[PDB]
């Protein structure tokens, strides 16, 4: 059928607070070759946050990460986590979970999307 890309992890925290993201893939399983997030302040462009893939490789949007975000992968099928601490307001986004597809040809690409949750962080 399909793939499904399941957020979690998210909701409202304060200023200073953590949060842990988690994508767990579901649907028409497939072999993942990257899965990260990326996320859309309002009115804003959406951008990068972090990534990783199968073989363990890290990347980040060191510029707004600034090394506040851990990501890593879970133990189960495309199982994804993203430690956020030291949260602000500009961290306020609505967080999209990728998924890449080593079927598709795309090195390191995304294919699949998950829906978004909401990140609210209060002053």
């Known amino acids: 059928s399909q793939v499904q890309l399941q957020e979690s992890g998210g909701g409202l925290v304060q200023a200073g607070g953590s949060l842990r993201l988690s994508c767990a893939a579901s649907?028409?399983?497939?072999?993942?070759?990257?899965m990260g997030w990326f996320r859309q302040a309002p009115g804003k462009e959406r951008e990068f946050v972090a990534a990783v893939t199968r073989s363990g490789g890290k990347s980040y949007n060191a510029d707004s990460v600034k090394g506040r975000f851990t990501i890593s992968r879970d133990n189960a099928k495309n199982t994804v986590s993203l430690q956020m601490n030291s949260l602000k307001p500009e961290d306020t986004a609505v967080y999209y979970c990728?998924?890449?597809?080593?079927?598709?040809?795309?090195?390191?690409?995304?294919?699949?999307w998950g829906q978004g949750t909401q990140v609210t962080v209060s002053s």
């Open positions: 990728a998924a890449g597809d080593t079927a598709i040809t795309s090195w390191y690409g995304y294919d699949y």
């Open positions: 649907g028409r399983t497939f072999s993942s070759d990257v």
